């Protein structure tokens, strides 16, 4: 859906900005510094679930640029496994949110954050 | 969820970039220049539906900036009506996509696009 590679870069950077906001805004809740409203979090994690599937289609062939390392393309199977592990951890976070349990939410939240960082460590320029 | 007003601006600009891509990528389909896959469009419009609810929470009090006109805040009821008309037209587009009918899709698509432009004409700086 991108006329030029710059358009895919702009897309993925916007998707990740959104995804970072919907993930990160829950930090005060999982730390206990903001109240835990199970319905509020369930609804936010549903938004996060939709957003977290979006970046990966915007790393198609020929869309080198931004802070993406070229290894995303030359090691595509390994990149796909990092994105699928991440997505699997988002499924786990959805489960916790749907269960309404702050203990499970905080554990699932930490797993997701670990998966974000692991991908960045391998595939994001510094 | 925004530490500073700049963060709300960055959010809404990223949300609209996404929303513009999920709307605009259907232009070749509704013009007949790309094939119509009812399931493909249904799934894309579901993504668009989620994204099209996101910008409005990022125009909260004190988040003046970007290309937002100050009238968004001083005429809040009129801005809310433009965003709700837009959202209602997205419901209509979802209905058409869910029905699998290219004729209805193209009409609903044009209604949504009209609603985007009407808001920009009143509330977006040029
Ligand atoms: C690989 C499978 C990744 C996972 C999982 C996550 N991120 Fe990521 N991120 C990745 C890349 C390759 C890049 C660079 C994209 C580019 O072309 O520039 C990024 C970048 C970011 C950014 C910066 C976005 C920008 O506005 O320029 C942020 C804020 C970010 N990523 C956040 C983030 C979060 C919160 C994640 C888990 C919930 C996450 N990423 C996962 C690769 C991957
Ligand atoms: C008011 C109810 C709006 C509706 C409906 C739509 N848009 Fe909009 N848009 C609006 C404002 C006030 C602004 C400026 C935001 C800012 O703070 O800068 C915008 C901006 C855009 C942009 C530019 C985003 C950027 O990256 O800076 C685009 C591409 C855009 N809008 C697209 C768009 C589409 C496709 C819409 C209908 C599907 C749509 N907007 C509706 C206000 C409103
Ligand atoms: O909110 C975020 O969380 C991840 C990471 O900091 C987790 O360690 C990331 O890259 C963000 O912007
Ligand atoms: O794709 C878009 O459609 C609307 C508008 O052009 C409809 O007239 C807009 O502002 C876009 O970026």
Swiss-Prot record, chains A, B:
GO terms for molecular function: electron transfer activity; heme binding; iron ion binding. Keywords: Electron transport, Heme, Iron, Metal-binding, Periplasm, Pyrrolidone carboxylic acid, Transport. Disulfide bonds: none annotated. Its main location: periplasm. GO terms for biological process: electron transport chain. It comes from the Bacteria. It is found in: Periplasm. The modification Pyrrolidone carboxylic acid is found at residue 1. GO terms for cellular component: periplasmic space. Gene3D superfamilies: Cytochrome c/b562 (1.20.120.10). Heme c binds at residues 12-13, 67, 116, 119-120. Binds 1 heme c group covalently per subunit. Cytochrome c' is the most widely occurring bacterial c-type cytochrome. Cytochromes c' are high-spin proteins and the heme has no sixth ligand. Their exact function is not known. Homodimer. This is Cytochrome c'. It comes from Alcaligenes xylosoxydans xylosoxydans. The lineage of its organism: Bacteria, Pseudomonadati, Pseudomonadota, Betaproteobacteria, Burkholderiales.
């Amino acid at each position: 859906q991108f006329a030029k590679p710059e358009d895919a870069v702009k897309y993925r950077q916007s998707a990740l900005t959104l995804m970072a906001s919907h993930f990160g805004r829950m930090t005060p809740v999982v730390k206990g510094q903001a109240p835990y409203d199970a319905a509020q979090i369930k609804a936010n994690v549903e938004v996060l679930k939709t957003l977290s599937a979006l970046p990966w289609a915007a790393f198609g062939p020929g869309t080198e640029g931004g802070d993406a390392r070229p290894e995303i393309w030359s090691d595509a199977a390994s990149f796909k496994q990092k994105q699928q592990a991440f997505q699997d951890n988002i499924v786990k976070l959805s489960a916790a949110a749907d269960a309404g349990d702050l203990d499970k939410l905080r554990a699932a939240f930490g797993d997701v954050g670990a998966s974000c960082k692991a991908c960045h460590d391998a595939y994001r320029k510094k």
